[PDB]
Amino acid sequence: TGLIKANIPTRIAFQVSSKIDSRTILDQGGAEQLLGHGDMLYLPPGTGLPIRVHGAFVSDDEVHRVVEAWKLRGAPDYIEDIL
Amino acid sequence: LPPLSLLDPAEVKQKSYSPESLEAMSRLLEIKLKEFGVEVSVDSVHPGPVITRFEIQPAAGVKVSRISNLAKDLARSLAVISVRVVEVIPGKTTVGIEIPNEDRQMVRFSEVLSSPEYDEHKSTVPLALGHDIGGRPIITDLAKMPHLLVAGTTGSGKSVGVNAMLLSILFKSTPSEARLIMIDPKMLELSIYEGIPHLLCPVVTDMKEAANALRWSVAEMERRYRLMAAMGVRNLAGFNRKVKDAEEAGTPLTDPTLPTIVVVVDEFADMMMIVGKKVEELIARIAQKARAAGIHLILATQRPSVDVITGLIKANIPTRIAFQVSSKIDSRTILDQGGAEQLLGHGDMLYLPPGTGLPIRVHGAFVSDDEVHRVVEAWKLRGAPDYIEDIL
Amino acid sequence: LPPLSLLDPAEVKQKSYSPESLEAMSRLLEIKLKEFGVEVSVDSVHPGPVITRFEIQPAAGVKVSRISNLAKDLARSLAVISVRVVEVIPGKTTVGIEIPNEDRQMVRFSEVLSSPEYDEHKSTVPLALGHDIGGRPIITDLAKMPHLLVAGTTGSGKSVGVNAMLLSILFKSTPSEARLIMIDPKMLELSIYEGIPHLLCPVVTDMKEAANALRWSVAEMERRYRLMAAMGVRNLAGFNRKVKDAEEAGTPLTDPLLSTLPTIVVVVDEFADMMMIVGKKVEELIARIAQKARAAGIHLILATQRPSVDVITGLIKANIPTRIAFQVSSKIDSRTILDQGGAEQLLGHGDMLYLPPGTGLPIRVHGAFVSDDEVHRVVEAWKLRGAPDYIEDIL
Ligand SMILES: Nc1ncnc2c1ncn2[C@@H]1O[C@H](COP(=O)(O)OP(=O)(O)O)[C@@H](O)[C@H]1O
Ligand SMILES: Nc1ncnc2c1ncn2[C@@H]1O[C@H](COP(=O)(O)OP(=O)(O)O)[C@@H](O)[C@H]1O
């Protein structure tokens, strides 16, 4: 809405279909000419042109390595009241 | 399961449109577009069952929208009903023009299930839709989509595609594998299946007990999530793997396999009209938590208008199938992309897989009422009915 | 049955536009378009009773919008009211133009009835509308509409056409096959049918009275489905041939929870006032019956005199796809009733566009002007057959 977008300045658009959606999130017609596979437009904090920055591909396998490495040297920490 | 040969074998017929006739059509297309304000060059013709794709290297300088605003004019200059104009094909510099044939042949359904991409396919819920424009078979997994919406203009072959999907389930199913619930607010055509083992309830006509069945769907979803979370497997498929491999040791895992329940809803327009927005939120939560639950959803609408196919329905469901819809307001409505005005009818699926992709144009296979009756008789001989008393 | 009788004798008229004047009109159209920015090669003509069908083969390098924009401007140049542009002909290359012809016949209702086709409609509930642009009779079956929506801005005829379809129901039926119930917003005209042996209730006036009749129809549809599913057969016609083959030689069956259940027809004169008095109950009950009415044999014939979106909603366009639109005065309304457009360019006096079940191809139908005289003659000739037997549980 005009109540969440106006509160949060910095936003990143991936490939969306319409130019209408490009004017929806980025408020500038850029987010329709991308390629998929993590082709971002980085609308920076502040104002300028969108900075086209590629994503970084990471598989689930390296994520499993990170999960196990934090299970080794890690211990849980929960709060009851938040649920 | 019954053998495939209970239904009609292949149409022993092909009307080979000659290279003479295709060359004549190519030069006719060239001269007719030269008469309008474009300049054109046909290079390669790829005929097919219903249409005939013409790739085109256009002349230097011409745009593409100046082609795409010539649909009606090219149609009346070629004497068809519509000329769908594909504006992009990857890998080439071509503008696709699709032109219907003279003798529109019919897609036999055994020809669809004659494919090795159906035969070696082993997911429990394939939905064999039919042939692509090059006669290539297209079977998409419902376990990967994992929802699909169907639309058309009343009698363009909505329920024909639904019958195709249901037979595509039934020819690769046991009731341990697959499982059905058929909500239908009209009782017209989907009632024929009533008696097969793969159901859970009768063909639910009245919509308030259909809402009971949808709340039962949400409850079975939650119960199945708690069952998998107690057993510690992500999705349904690996869970069935673990269960049957522990069964092969000799110990069925006790309860603190599972069926791939498919709950179809033909014509949820009356579902969202008779009972209010709570049915829409039931569709919302079902289509939210589904792809690991093995609870897939098949929808249908005779009206693709914005107050029926509302953004909450369009929220989860990636995959959409459009038949011949009335105008480009409705094409932009459902497919989120123009084009679906310009189909021919009688089972023309603009298929749309999940992902930012150009839509695939495929044709349904015309399955009769009679073959449906044959399959119903074959299963009610082969399998016994099975239900749940207090499902509603 | 009443014989083919009490109709107006189709009088001798012979003004069938000999091809001298037709060739003159064709060259006149070629000039009067050549005056504007189009080149036109006229090909062949289909002369008819009301309009005259033409086939323009346009020249090389011209669109169709260069015809369709200047419908008004051509219309002020041919001494007509308004011409109509057909943008697609089935199977040919031409572009259609229907010129209003300034000497018309009234399409006699007997001429519709005296077709071979009307004697060959097997169904008990036909709909005899009139002739098309060729003059061939266009008769539809009400069992495969499955419902009907009527438009018209107090224009051509909106009362006529309803009266025409109702008298066409009456000429091939029995009261043991098809009994109707009307709801009358303005008690003006169809309070004339009282006294016939197929009319299940007297005239209904109030919308708050009419909600009782609508809920009676819903309850009758529900017990109809209970009775069908207790007998296994899907719809009504299979059930009636089942009761034929059951009690043919004598094999009794009564009270399954007994004769053929009649094909009930519910008709509405002015649906606008029905929504305007009762806003919410009526429209949801109409969509309820439009959902479950086709198999039950209960049918619904609607008719609005205002083509607004306040009246015609998606809830009314939920399950009534067959549209009959008369002349309306708004292209916005022309795309309100029909999914296509162009229904403003008609002529009046019994002219409708017929939109068939499903497929988008608007048939143009000239409705048959039937007088009040034949209405309250056939009523009197039909009151011989019995008394207006009533089921007073409707209210
Ligand atoms: N592959 C096909 N070949 C021929 N006709 C088809 C084919 N697919 C659909 N149809 C036509 O579609 C119609 C069925 O439409 P249906 O699915 O019942 O839509 P609805 O339920 O809205 O009426 C039938 O008239 C049938 O002839
Ligand atoms: N083919 C015809 N030729 C001449 N007059 C006709 C024809 N068809 C209908 N009419 C007349 O035009 C009038 C239109 O009335 P209508 O618009 O139906 O009134 P309302 O809108 O109040 O029902 C009818 O009363 C009828 O007498």
Curated annotation (Swiss-Prot), chain A:
Protein's cellular compartments: Cell inner membrane
Residues holding ATP: 37, 55-56
Coiled coil: none
Comment, domains: Consists of an N-terminal domain, which is sufficient for the localization to the septal ring and is required for cell division, followed by a linker domain, and a C-terminal domain, which forms the translocation motor involved in chromosome segregation. The C-terminal domain can be further subdivided into alpha, beta and gamma subdomains. The alpha and beta subdomains multimerise to produce a hexameric ring, contain the nucleotide binding motif and form the DNA pump.
Subunit structure: Homohexamer. Forms a ring that surrounds DNA.
Family, as annotated: Belongs to the FtsK/SpoIIIE/SftA family.
Cited function: Essential cell division protein that coordinates cell division and chromosome segregation. The N-terminus is involved in assembly of the cell-division machinery. The C-terminus functions as a DNA motor that moves dsDNA in an ATP-dependent manner towards the dif recombination site, which is located within the replication terminus region. Translocation stops specifically at Xer-dif sites, where FtsK interacts with the Xer recombinase, allowing activation of chromosome unlinking by recombination. FtsK orienting polar sequences (KOPS) guide the direction of DNA translocation.
Name of the protein this chain belongs to: DNA translocase FtsK
